[PDB]
Amino acid sequence: MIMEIPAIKALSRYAQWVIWKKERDTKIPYNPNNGKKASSTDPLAWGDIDEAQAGLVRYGANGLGFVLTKSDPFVFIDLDHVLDENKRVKCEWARQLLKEIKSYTEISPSGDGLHVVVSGKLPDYIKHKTKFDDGSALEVYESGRYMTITGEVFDGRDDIKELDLSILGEFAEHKILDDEAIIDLMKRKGQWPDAPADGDDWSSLDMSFANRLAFWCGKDIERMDRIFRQSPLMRQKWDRPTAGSTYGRITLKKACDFVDSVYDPALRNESDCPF
Ligand SMILES: Nc1ccn([C@H]2CC[C@@H](COP(=O)(O)OP(=O)(O)OP(=O)(O)O)O2)c(=O)n1
Ligand SMILES: [Ca+2]
Ligand SMILES: [Ca+2]
Ligand SMILES: [Ca+2]
C-alpha cells in the first residue's frame, strides 16, 4: 500500500524508521525491533521500513515514523488543524501555502491536519512554531525530531520535491531624528533608491546608495547607518560578520573614502546623478 508511494520509496532507503503510540496527547516513538522507547538522536534505536512494518504489528503501534537527522535533507512542514470534517483546507493561510509549496502532502493521523515533506533547507530566521488565532499552527523541523508517516496522500501530491523554502518567511513568525529631513531631501532630489528587483546585483545597489548617503549625510557614519536601515536596500547581510567588521560597516566606510563632496546645509548641487 504505502511502500509504492514515491515519497515512501525515498524514505525507505534509510534505516531511520520508528513506530509510535499515542500516550495521552503526545506521540512517543518506539524502537520497532525491541519495542522500547526510542530516542531521536540514537540511530541504533531505529530500523529500516521492514522492521518498522513488522514491529508495527507486533507491539500494536498507532503508525510508522521517520526520524529527521542532520545528514538527510527532508524538511517536515506540519500544518495543524487546517482541514474541516470533509478533509478540505479550511484555513486561508494553508490554502496559500499549498499553492506556494507543492511537494509530498499527506493527511496527519488525527485527520484534520496536513504534513508537507520537502527536500531543502529552512530559513534560519523563522520560528519552529507559529500559532494562529484560528487554532491552526505552522511548524517546521529539519532534524532532532521524528515525523509520523501515514501515506494518506493529499491532492495527489505523492512525490518529495527539492524546493526553495524562502516563501515560508511570509507565513511563519520571525525572530531576532534629523534623518527624516535628510531622507525627504533625498527623495526630493531623486536620490532615494527603489526596492531591488530580480536579477539585480543587490551588493552593487548598496554601494551606489551608500556613496550618495556619504554625500547627503556628511560622512556621519552613524547617520548613514540609521538611514540605510530605513531604506528598501536593507537586509540581513548588512549586519553579517565579515573580516572583523560587518558587510554594512565595510560598505559605509568605503563610501566615506570614495566621495569628496559633502552636503553642509548650504547648496546641494554637488554630486551624484538621480536614480
Ligand atoms: N520528541 C518528539 C516526538 C514527537 N514530536 C513529533 C511527532 C509528530 C510531530 C507532529 O506533531 P503533532 O501535530 O502533534 O503530530 P502529528 O503526526 O502531526 O498528528 P496530528 O497533527 O494529526 O495531531 O511532532 C516531536 O515534536 N518531537
Ligand atoms: Ca500535525
Ligand atoms: Ca504539531
Ligand atoms: Ca535534515
Residue numbers in the entry: 1 to 176, 191 to 289
Sentences copied from the publication:
PrimPols are a class of primases that belong to the archaeo-eukaryotic primase (AEP) superfamily but have both primase and DNA polymerase activities. Replicative polymerase from NrS-1 phage (NrSPol) is a representative of the PrimPols. The domain organization of NrSPol is similar to that of ORF904, while the PrimPol domain of NrSPol lacks the typical zinc finger motif found in ORF904 and many other AEP family proteins, and the C-terminus of NrSPol has a unique helicase domain that forms a ring-shaped architecture and increases the polymerization activity of NrSPol. The processivity of NrSPol is dramatically enhanced when associated with NrS-1 phage-encoded helicase and ssDNA-binding protein, indicating that NrSPol is a replicative DNA polymerase capable of synthesizing the NrS-1 phage genome de novo.
In this study, to explore the structural basis of N300’s primase and primer extension functions, we determined the crystal structures of N300 in complex with ddCTP. The structure of N300 consists of two domains: a primase-like (Prim/Pol) domain located at the N-termini and a HBD at the C-termini. The two domains are connected by a linker region (178–195), of which electron density is missing due to flexibility. As is shown in Figure 1B, the primase-like domain adopts a saddle-shaped fold that resembles the previously reported PrimPol domain of ORF904 but with several significant differences. Frist, the primase-like domain of NrSPol utilizes a serine-rich loop with an SPS motif (S108, P109, and S110) instead of the very conserved zinc finger motif in the active site. Interestingly, the electron density of the S108 side chain extends to the γ-phosphate of ddCTP with a close O-O distance of 2.5 Å, suggesting a strong hydrogen bond. The side chain of S110 is also adjacent to the γ phosphate of ddCTP, with a O-O distance over 2.6 Å. This structure indicates that S108 and S110 coordinate ddCTP and are likely critical for N300’s primase and polymerase activities. Second, a chelated metal ion is found at the bottom of the N300 structure that is not present in any other PrimPol or primase structures. Given the high Ca2+ concentration in the crystal solution (100 mM), this metal ion is assigned as Ca2+, which is coordinated by the main chain carbonyl oxygens of T69, D72, F74, and E142.
